[PDB]
Amino acid sequence: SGFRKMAFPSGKVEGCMVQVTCGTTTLNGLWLDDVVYCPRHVICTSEDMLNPNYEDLLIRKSNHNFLVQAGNVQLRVIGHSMQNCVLKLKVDTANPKTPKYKFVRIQPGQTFSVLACYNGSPSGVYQCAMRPNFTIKGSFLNGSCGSVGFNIDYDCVSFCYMHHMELPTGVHAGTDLEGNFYGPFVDRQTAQAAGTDTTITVNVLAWLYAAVINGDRWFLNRFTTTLNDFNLVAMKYNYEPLTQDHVDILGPLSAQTGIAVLDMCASLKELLQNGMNGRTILGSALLEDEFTPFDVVRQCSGVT
């Protein structure tokens, strides 16, 4: 028993973290096989970031200008190319610690673990979610760029995110491992609207099932609802509309607890309309939306 915001074990990802220096800029790189992946803003000075012409800035750079350092050993750069907002540095040595890996583009509402790095060194690991508006509420300081988000299925690491930017609002933006930004963000120090964010409804319901599994049951009630009645409430409270796909993904949790999905929706409706009344659920005074139904099942079953 017990429910925690757990991150995947970070070892397989620590072994890929390298330091990438270009001119005066240093950020983090991801070394998989004979390729180092890093944000393309490694070629910019602070004044370049205002309105950078990346093609033109990269043209002034050569393989010898990119300093890649793994731990304490230098890697020889033999190729460089720009793919969207990432640079791919071909090095002459395959990373001996390259795990089984995939590059995946996660969906809004999905969760992942971030290994925060500075100067190619890992400082911490946390579990977070890709918000519906495609930002992440991370913990990133200067030099954190190039830090990656990932999931782990047994031995295969699915890299899903690379940190690029902190918006003036304090939220974070980044790309998939092909350099495509999540959301409408561009890699420029300019005004950028994050957009209206919503609460991930399926995740809150999943977390309410983890609460019932772990003993916190006070929020359970004598009521039920319909998808449409619940969705009217979700609209009023800036929650993502619940669809039959969300109900279907909640099937395993609904089966384990014996509480129908729409019955749990009625509980969520009452918590939305009445608040917590000074009580807590799984040690939290707000409705948690950073645990997916897959995460709750994984944590309550013990998948390693």
Next chain:
Amino acid sequence: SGFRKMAFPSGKVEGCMVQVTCGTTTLNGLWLDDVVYCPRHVICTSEDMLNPNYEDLLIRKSNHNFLVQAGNVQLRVIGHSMQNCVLKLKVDTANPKTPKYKFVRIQPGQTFSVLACYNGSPSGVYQCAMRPNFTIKGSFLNGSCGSVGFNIDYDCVSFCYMHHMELPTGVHAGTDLEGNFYGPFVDRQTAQAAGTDTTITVNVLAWLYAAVINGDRWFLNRFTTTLNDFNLVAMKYNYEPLTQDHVDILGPLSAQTGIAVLDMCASLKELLQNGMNGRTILGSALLEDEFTPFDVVRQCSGVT
């Protein structure tokens, strides 16, 4: 910017995790040098746990009865001994992945990262605190026993905790790496009082400083207090009394923000007496006590 419940990178600890089987019981072991450390209840069946005589149960066991498996390779056990509530299995091979390490006994209120394991395999990592009553609010299922808590200073892992037991209340109890329980707990399936827990005052204040650093300042007020006036309030709300040592440890955060410690105490006093009024601080609707002043400084400075 951004503030997260960050855990240390778990790689150095993943490389020490082994599976320990004795009879029909399997739990996790910690392989450092040529020694595997695991909870001594690995020698018990479920019926033994009611009132076990560990000396007598261990006497029926020989080195060949302890099956230690690292990944997919078996370790040869050449010695066994019981130290308090841990078994030390001398194996014939030193763990090649043994990092620089220390065995430390942490103080109540201090934090650490837990690498949850099942069958010697790491499933997740989370940051938690040793409660003032010496329990931990972890996330542990059957087979999690032998999972360890630790801190990391550059390259040195300080092992501070080994999971042993889940109390009927759903809280967790365990030992230091010499087998000494934190708190009054015994390794028996019997009624065990956890004791009155309190909120770690210094940690809440530290987290309030991290909120000011990161922008959440609404809770700041035109008031100040004294250690004694604040402590009367702390008493009423089951908060640990604040001492001059706590004020002293808050010095760096007080210096960074320019907000005197007793001025932040006055803010905490008002939050205790008036609640949050439906607002949040660092995305939380309650006062967080699982970040020490050292953790806030580390996270806001970027120590790797």
